[PDB]
Design a protein around this ligand. Structure first.
Ligand code: CLA
Ligand code: CLA
Ligand code: CLA
Ligand code: CLA
Ligand code: CLA
Ligand code: CLA
Ligand code: CLA
Ligand code: CLA
Ligand SMILES: CC1=C[C@H](O)CC(C)(C)C1/C=C/C(C)=C/C=C/C(C)=C/C=C/C=C(C)/C=C/C=C(C)/C=C/C1=C(C)C[C@H](O)CC1(C)C
Ligand SMILES: CC1=C(/C=C/C(C)=C/C=C/C(C)=C\C=C\C=C(C)\C=C\C=C(C)\C=C\C2=C(C)CCCC2(C)C)C(C)(C)CCC1
Ligand SMILES: O=P(O)(O)OC[C@H](O)CO
Lengths: 40, 195, 152, 146
């Protein structure tokens, strides 16, 4: 089963990483949309 | 000495020679020995928190029943001065300036143990960068050895303690002690979960 | 800064009303209780909300009626650039430091290029969090943050 | 500890080289191979175990509704204390994972029952979802008619 892991460790890694990154960013924007500034 | 986690194991840099060694450096900042000798000094000076955290906590609980009528630690900006605030900063700065550099040399070369203007008198007699005996220790306590590990450990908790104080203040809008006692209003419902 | 804040703005205020009326024009053909209905109304509250928030946080708004950011460093408007900027550099460095830390660990032994196209080494042993404290790379600078091969 | 005799799931034949019946409960099952690496199996093993141990208890939750034919501060604290507690618990269990012939029987049997709860604990809910009805009575209540 070593094989599947490696398979998931090529440029696909990039897609999974960018999909995870996109999901994070979009969800952040859902909770805090129309953000023109950091006010805290 | 001990280990922060049973597995994973201590690094080689964390020999145990240093007081308060527990093999906790997962990231790896202190890996270069020159790097440690500096971070060892920083941990002591930051740690010694203690002075302050106790300074912001204890007077807050001395004003518990009405023994003293002093403002909160986060309200002591003015007019806690017979000379106004801006006077004090410069005095605090200029002289602290002096003490800090002198302390600085001892980190690179120990050092500046001797007195200065003094016309005909003694000088500090000591060894070790982080801890200088002398009036710094008028009692002449025991530079041991375990305390050195006691010193740390208490300073480390104070640090986390400070981090607690400031955070908690925000949200709990008031005193880290009111805070403390708002929790005691029969907790189990008075948790940070509330906020 | 000839701009007068989004609160006492007549244009930026007018712009809010113009946008929501157009949205309201659209729901008239779908009949409330319907799907395209909320979606339009949900869009309207977001519209009101973002206009409401911008006036709160300051934001000066020009004569055109749109907020203009001030990046001079003015303490009144730090949240418009500096504070987000500090946050960016943090993440920007973190990425930079983690990536650099990786290629360094790879170089000794193995076939180095093998690790570059395939990284069945994840964060190596545990390299990611090392970025939590990247700024301590200042101390890496005083030692060997740079190689001495070419120039100084 | 090798044998071609173990009651395979699918008779004639079922022999994956990784599985051998050395382990307890080895009914020769894994077409996917979801663990052909010893690092792969040694982990799966522990995984397939702890699960079962939990599932059993879950079963012990199906034991209570037939005895009779949820908090002082709902969730929140109840969880953090749980997280904080089972954490340390599971904590050390983690550190241990990476650092008599009679007993084989016990452990072979332990897994199989354990395997049962999971299939069980599972069943009671994907029958409960979409289909608002408890399983409490169903054994002889649904046996009245298909
Ligand atoms: C490179 C220049 C640039 C810059 C500086 C920005 C900046 C911004 N954009 Mg724009 N954008 C750009 C190019 C740029 N964009 C381009 C080329 C396009 C075309 C694809 C877009 C299309 C676009 C859309 C559709 C939107 C934006 C939005 C935004 C704002 C979102 C802030 C936010 O995400 O909340 C906060 C996010 C974080 C704080 C993430 C960091 C936290 C991490 C994940 C964790 C850190 C833990 C410590 C921000 C002002 C949004 C907006 O509403 O504008 C006001 C929005 O709707 N952009
Ligand atoms: C200034 C504070 C400070 C400094 C300079 C040090 C320095 C040191 N520590 Mg110590 N430590 C501290 C605080 C500090 N510590 C606290 C508060 C604790 C309680 C957990 C510990 C627990 C600890 C253990 C168990 C060990 C050490 C050890 C060491 C030595 C090796 C590791 C190192 O280089 O540290 C690097 C210095 C830093 C990383 C300073 C910056 C740290 C970041 C930026 C602060 C994080 C802020 C906070 C998390 C923000 C909120 C986060 C959010 C999620 C809420 C070195 C002398 C090891 C040792 O052998 O001692 C001799 C050892 O094993 N420390
Ligand atoms: C290390 C950090 C630190 C620490 C440890 C302290 C500690 C203290 N501060 Mg301080 N402070 C700090 C930082 C710190 N501060 C900073 C950064 C600021 C901004 C300037 C201040 C500003 C500040 C102000 C304005 C004051 C303090 C005060 C105090 C003291 C409060 C208790 C008291 O009134 O006298 C101690 C209590 C006693 C001595 C009780 C015994 C009194 C004797 C026995 C007389 C007997 C009377 C009678 C017979 C007793 C019977 C009474 C009965 C009826 C109950 C305490 C020593 C108060 C102070 O200066 O204290 C005098 C106060 O005025 N601080
Ligand atoms: C370096 C340690 C330190 C820290 C942590 C603080 C922290 C603070 N100071 Mg202080 N100050 C310091 C050193 C420090 N000071 C020194 C060395 C001086 C010169 C003697 C002063 C002189 C000073 C004045 C005159 C005032 C403060 C005030 C404040 C408060 C600012 C507002 C605030 O926090 O709201 C809340 C924080 C969060 C929500 C987070 C804050 C508690 C202000 C204050 O006391 O508030 C009324 C204020 O007027 N400081
Ligand atoms: C600047 C560095 C420096 C250093 C290393 C010392 C070191 C020392 N001083 Mg000195 N002192 C200093 C600056 C310094 N002093 C300054 C600027 C003043 C005022 C100008 C004094 C006034 C002073 C007095 C009155 C005394 C000391 C004394 C001492 C010794 C007692 C033990 C101790 O201090 O701890 C120790 C040798 C004690 C001593 O033995 O005198 C020589 C003594 O009680 N110091
Ligand atoms: C183009 C050159 C230039 C540069 C390098 C800077 C740099 C800076 N400015 Mg200045 N500024 C400039 C032009 C510049 N400014 C001009 C032309 C104006 C007139 C509109 C200003 C008006 C201005 C104000 C009102 C403030 C700054 C502040 C700052 C500091 C913000 C960062 C900080 O506080 O710590 C992170 C930073 C050093 C702030 C400051 O002084 O720090 C507290 C601040 O209050 N700037
Ligand atoms: C300095 C900071 C620091 C940090 C971040 C940790 C963190 C941890 N410790 Mg450690 N520990 C420390 C200092 C620290 N320790 C020191 C100074 C000592 C004395 C040498 C120990 C002695 C110690 C022992 C004996 C054990 C731990 C264990 C643990 C883990 C328990 C996790 C858990 O379930 O609790 C709560 C979970 C959540 C909140 C989620 C956790 C990773 C336990 C462990 O190893 O677990 C496998 C364990 O048994 N620690
Ligand atoms: C299809 C028919 C069938 C047959 C022949 C068996 C046979 C067996 N089952 Mg099984 N089972 C079945 C259907 C069947 N089951 C079904 C349909 C289910 C789901 C409800 C189960 C659920 C089940 C569980 C949970 C367990 C068994 C166990 C056992 C074994 C216990 C006896 C033993 O090994 O002695 C051991 C031999 C010696 C001690 C030496 C000889 C001594 C004896 C006294 C002579 C035995 C091999 C047990 C097991 O797997 O091993 C413990 C067990 O825990 N079964
Ligand atoms: C909270 C509480 C409290 C109280 O006490 C009571 C109550 C309420 C009840 C509770 C609890 C409960 C619980 C704990 C539960 C649990 C459960 C579980 C664990 C399950 C599993 C479950 C699990 C499961 C199903 C699993 C399954 C699995 C499977 C199928 C697998 C398969 C396979 C394999 C093998 C391999 C090959 O090659 C392939 C495949 C095909 C892939
Ligand atoms: C303040 C401010 C401003 C200004 C700014 C300025 C003007 C500045 C500057 C600046 C400058 C003029 C700087 C410089 C420099 C330099 C150099 C010489 C460099 C370097 C570097 C390095 C070496 C890095 C490295 C690394 C890291 C560390 C991270 C990651 C990456 C690597 C890895 C890449 C304005 C006002 C605009 C805005 C507001 C704020
Ligand atoms: O050795 P401990 O258990 O006192 O650990 C220190 C705490 O994490 C805070 O100092």
């Amino acid at each position: 089963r070593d094989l599947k892991t490696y398979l998931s460790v090529a440029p696909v890694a990039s897609t999974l990483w960018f999909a995870a990154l996109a999901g994070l960013l979009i969800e952040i924007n859902r909770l805090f949309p129309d953000a023109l500034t950091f006010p805290f | 000495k001990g280990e922060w986690l049973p597995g994973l194991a201590s690094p080689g840099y964390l020999t145990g020679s240093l007081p308060g060694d527990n093999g906790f450096d997962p990231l790896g900042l202190a890996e270069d020995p020159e790097n440690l000798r500096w971070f060892v000094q920083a941990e002591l000076v930051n740690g010694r928190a203690m002075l302050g955290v106790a300074g912001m906590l204890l007077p807050e609980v001395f004003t518990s029943i009405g023994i003293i009528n002093v403002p909160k630690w986060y309200d002591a900006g003015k007019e806690e001065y017979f000379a106004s605030s801006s006077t004090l900063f410069v005095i605090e700065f200029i002289l602290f300036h002096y003490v800090e550099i002198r302390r600085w040399q001892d980190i690179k070369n120990p050092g500046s143990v001797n007195q200065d203007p003094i016309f005909k008198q003694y000088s500090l007699p000591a060894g070790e960068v982080g801890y200088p005996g002398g009036i710094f220790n008028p009692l002449n306590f025991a530079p041991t050895l375990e305390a050195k590990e006691k010193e740390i450990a208490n300073g480390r908790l104070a640090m986390l303690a400070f981090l607690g104080f400031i955070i908690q203040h925000n949200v709990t809008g008031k005193g880290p002690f009111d805070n403390l006692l708002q929790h005691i209003s029969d907790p189990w419902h008075n948790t940070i979960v509330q906020t | 800064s000839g701009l007068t804040p989004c609160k006492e703005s007549k244009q930026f205020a007018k712009r809010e009303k113009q946008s929501i009326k157009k949205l309201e024009s659209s729901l008239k053909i779908y009949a409330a209780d319907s799907a395209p209905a909320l979606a339009i109304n949900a869009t309207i509250e977001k519209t009101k909300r973002r206009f409401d928030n911008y006036a709160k946080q300051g934001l000066l708004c020009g004569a055109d009626g749109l907020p203009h950011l001030i990046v001079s460093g003015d303490q009144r408007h730090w949240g418009e650039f500096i504070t987000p900027g500090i946050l960016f550099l943090y993440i920007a460095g973190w990425i930079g430091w983690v990536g650099r830390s990786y290629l360094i660990a790879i170089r000794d032994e193995k076939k180095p290029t093998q690790k570059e196209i395939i990284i069945d080494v994840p964060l190596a042993s545990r390299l990611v969090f090392r970025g939590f404290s990247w700024p301590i790379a200042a101390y890496r600078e005083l030692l060997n943050g740079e190689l001495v091969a070419k120039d100084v | 500890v090798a044998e071609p005799d173990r009651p395979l799931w699918f008779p004639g034949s079922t022999p994956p080289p990784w599985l051998d019946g050395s382990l307890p409960g080895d009914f020769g099952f894994d077409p996917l191979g979801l663990g052909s690496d010893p690092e792969s199996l040694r982990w799966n093993v522990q995984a397939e175990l702890v699960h079962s141990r939990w599932a059993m208890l879950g079963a012990a939750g199906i034991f209570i509704p037939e005895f009779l034919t949820e908090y002082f501060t709902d969730t929140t604290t109840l969880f953090i204390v749980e997280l904080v507690f089972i954490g340390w618990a599971e904590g050390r269990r983690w550190a241990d994972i990476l650092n008599p012939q009679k007993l084989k029987e016990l452990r072979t049997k332990e897994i199989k029952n354990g395997r049962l709860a999971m299939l069980a604990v599972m069943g009671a809910w994907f029958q409960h979802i979409y289909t608002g009805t408890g399983p409490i009575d169903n054994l002889f209540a649904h046996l009245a008619d298909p």
